[PDB]
A paper describes a structure:
Nonribosomal peptide synthetases (NRPSs) are multimodular enzymes that catalyze the biosynthesis of diverse peptides with a wide variety of activities. The incorporation of an acyl into peptidyl backbone is usually implemented by a starter condensation (Cs) domain, normally located at the beginning of the initial NRPS module, via the formation of an amide bond to the α-amino group of the first amino acid residue, a process also known as lipoinitiation. Genome mining of two Cs domain-embedded cryptic NRPS biosynthetic gene clusters, rzmA and holA, in the bacterium P. rhizoxinica HKI 454 resulted in the discovery of two distinct types of lipopeptides, cyclic rhizomide A (1) containing an uncommon acetyl chain (C2) and linear holrhizin A (2) harboring a medium octanoyl (C8) chain. Similar to other C domain structures reported previously, RzmA-Cs adopts a “V-shaped” configuration and consists of two subdomains (N- and C-lobes) each representing the chloramphenicol acetyltransferase (CAT) fold.
Despite our successful purification of the dissected Cs domains of both RzmA and HolA, we were able to obtain crystals only for RzmA-Cs, and solved its structure at 2.3 Å in the P1 space group. Interestingly, in each asymmetric unit there are four molecules of RzmA-Cs with two different conformations. The overall structures of the two conformations are quite similar (RMSD = 1.52 Å for Cα), especially when the two lobes are compared separately (RMSD = 0.68 Å and 1.30 Å for Cα of the N- and C-lobes). The major difference comes from the relative positions of the two lobes (i.e., opening angles of the “V” as shown in Fig. 5c). Among a small group of candidate residues, R148 of RzmA (corresponding to A149 of HolA and M165 of CdaPS1) caught our attention. This residue not only sits near the proposed binding pocket for the 2,3-epoxyhexanoyl chain of CDA in the CdaPS1 structure, but also fits well with the simple logic that a longer side-chain of pocket residue would correlate with a shorter substrate chain, and vice versa (i.e., R148 with C2, M165 with C6, and A149 with C8).
Numbering used by the authors: 7 to 214, 222 to 234, 241 to 334, 337 to 431
Write the structure that this text describes.
């Protein structure tokens, strides 16, 4: 049958998993707590329909004489139904079962790349467990699969047939990438990114399993320009703390190649953003420089960052900090009962990841620091978060004030 090549990121994930077969670092996990009753047969039927709809769950990765390939197959899976109403601590028992699952390493060749389970923790409260592998799923695809599961289960439980899928097939992305691999546009993007990152520097970093610290706040001062402001603020903070005038940040971009719908499993492309800190620069100048730099690499955004890393002299990172500004995911409804999503495991740490979560029509922001434990301590991460948030509030208070004259308090 038709086999397809792995992306550079998928190849790196495969190689790192084979080098450390005992590490469950590539496992992505979450659970949906549903306040009500669930019919498990209908849920399994919906799970099976969406598995065939989000066919990235049907992907099989082989290592044949051709090389490391991927193809659409029929994966063998099961949906266990657990009852914890008789346990002394039902929620703790569900947490223990989920932790027993997502802490097991998974063999990529022939082993279940996803695991679906249902856990009854109360007479009117269930827990839908979802575990994937990083080689075929990200966070947004995870939420989209959960949402489609909720919709299809609700449709099947109240008789009506579910409306058509609004996902594209993963093979659309596979064919698009196969054509782009031999494109002249890819050669142009490669040349541009090798010229733009020519020589360069050490990534300005605060580097000194995953460490996660959350802070809530509201500030006196739109998603695109909130991302602009957060990028400029983190770059200025790195410049003020490390003393580096050339700061490189990672900015994930949803690559657009003509796909009408979203394809679960289609990863983002984290592009390096180079920002130069000249003396006497304010937040206005830094934000406009960031906008111009994002515009300069806009037509070249499809070149994968892993290829740019490997095609350079890197054994090992273009950037130490990535900035992710995204709204909160909408809460879900199963049949008619409420359900909230709760994260268990996400992608492994690339040094430091800054997540900025905002809600429409409100001033409140949520700031998440997801750091690599080998280069950050909890106390250091907390001090960095506090200092950065205070410095960012000072920035937002006056966009014309020079960054050099801002007090960096600890």
């Amino acid at each position: 049958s038709t086999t397809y090549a792995l992306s550079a990121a998928q190849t790196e994930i495969w190689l790192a998993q084979q080098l450390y077969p005992d590490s469950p670092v590539y496992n992505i996990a979450q659970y949906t707590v549903i306040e009500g009753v669930i019919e498990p047969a209908v849920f399994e039927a919906a799970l099976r329909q969406v598995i065939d709809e989000a066919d990235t769950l049907r992907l099989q990765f082989i290592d044949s004489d051709d090389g490391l390939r991927q193809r659409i197959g029929t994966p063998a899976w099961s949906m266990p139904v657990l009852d914890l109403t008789a346990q002394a601590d039902p929620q703790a028992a569900a947490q223990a079962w989920m932790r027993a699952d997502y802490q097991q390493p998974v063999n990529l060749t022939q082993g279940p790349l996803f695991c679906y389970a249902l856990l009854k923790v109360a007479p009117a409260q269930w827990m839908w467990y979802q575990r994937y592998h990083h080689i075929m799923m990200d966070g947004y695809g995870r939420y989209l699969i959960a949402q489609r599961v909720a919709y299809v289960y609700s449709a099947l439980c109240e008789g009506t047939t579910p409306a058509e899928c609004d996902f594209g097939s993963i093979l659309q992305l596979l064919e698009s990438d196969a054509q782009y691999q031999i494109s002249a546009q890819r050669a142009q993007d490669e040349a541009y990114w090798l010229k733009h990152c020519a020589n360069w520097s050490e990534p300005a970093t605060l580097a000194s399993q995953r460490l996660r610290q959350t802070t809530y706040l509201a500030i006196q001062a739109d998603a695109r320009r909130l991302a602009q402001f957060m990028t400029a603020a983190m770059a200025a903070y790195l410049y003020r703390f490390t003393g580096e005038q050339d700061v490189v940040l990672g900015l994930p971009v949803k690559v657009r190649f003509g796909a009408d719908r979203h394809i679960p499993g289609m990863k983002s492309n984290t592009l390096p953003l180079r920002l130069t800190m000249r003396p006497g620069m304010n937040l206005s100048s830094l934000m406009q420089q960031a906008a111009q730099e994002m515009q300069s690499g806009l037509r070249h955004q499809r070149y994968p960052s892993e290829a740019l890393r490997r095609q350079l002299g890197m054994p090992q990172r273009l950037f130490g900090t990535t900035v992710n500004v995204m709204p909160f995911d909408l809460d879900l409804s199963f049949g008619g009962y409420s359900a909230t999503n709760h994260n268990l495991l996400n992608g492994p740490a690339e040094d430091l990841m800054l997540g900025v979560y905002w809600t429409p029509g409100s001033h409140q922001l949520r700031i998440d620091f997801d750091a690599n434990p080998a280069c950050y301590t909890p106390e250091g991460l907390g001090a960095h978060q506090r200092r950065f948030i205070r410095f960012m509030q000072v920035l937002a208070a006056d966009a014309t004030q020079p960054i050099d004259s801002i007090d960096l308090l600890d």
